[PDB]
């Protein structure tokens, strides 16, 4: 139905990270490389 | 023990409406109306060049 | 969407408009429906 209170509420706190931005022609595209981050020196392959 | 069973949010699209002379199209139409076409019957033009 | 007095409040966008079911039809419950079935009221 036209319950348009889904989730807009308050728009809570931001902070700035270090993120990759690319411009693939229109849209903007996050890109992310993750080894090193959070897959590194485990005994846990890479999906 | 409680065992409840969860209708978890639902979420419906808003379908959008489009006026016709809102789309680039309609440059190459003449949107004119006219509220008595059904008993017109006929028309012509006698184009004088 | 399956209790439809939920789904009066929307509350989240109806966004991609895409052929639905016609896709993977991997829903657990979904109904095609017309301007008006009787099982709505």
Same mark, same amino acid.
């Given at each position: +139905?036209?319950?348009?209170?889904?989730? %807009?509420?308050?728009?809570?706190?931001?902070?700035?990270?270090?993120?990759?931005? /690319?411009? @693939?022609?229109?849209? %903007?595209? *996050?890109?992310?490389?993750?080894?090193?981050?959070?897959?590194?020196?485990?005994?846990?392959?890479?999906? | 023990? /409680?065992?409840?069973?969860?209708?978890?949010?639902?979420?419906? +699209?808003?379908?959008?409406?489009?006026?016709?002379?809102?789309?680039?199209?309609? /440059?190459?139409?003449?949107?004119?109306? *006219?509220?008595?076409?059904? &008993?017109? +019957?006929?028309?012509?033009?006698?184009?004088?060049? | 969407?399956?209790? &439809?007095?939920?789904?009066?409040?929307?509350?989240?966008? @109806? %966004?991609?408009?895409?052929?639905?079911?016609?896709?993977?039809? %991997?829903?657990? *419950? *979904?109904?095609?429906?017309?301007?008006?079935? +009787?099982?709505?009221?």
């Amino acid at each position: +139905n036209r319950e348009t209170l889904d989730e %807009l509420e308050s728009a809570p706190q931001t902070t700035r990270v270090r993120a990759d931005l /690319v411009a @693939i022609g229109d849209r %903007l595209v *996050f890109l992310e490389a993750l080894e090193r981050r959070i897959y590194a020196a485990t005994n846990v392959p890479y999906p | 023990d /409680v065992e409840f069973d969860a209708l978890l949010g639902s979420y419906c +699209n808003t379908l959008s409406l489009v006026r016709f002379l809102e789309l680039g199209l309609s /440059v190459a139409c003449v949107c004119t109306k *006219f509220p008595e076409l059904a &008993y017109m +019957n006929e028309g012509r033009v006698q184009f004088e060049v | 969407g399956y209790r &439809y007095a939920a789904a009066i409040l929307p509350t989240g966008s @109806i %966004l991609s408009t895409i052929e639905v079911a016609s896709h993977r039809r %991997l829903f657990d *419950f *979904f109904a095609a429906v017309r301007s008006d079935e +009787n099982s709505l009221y």
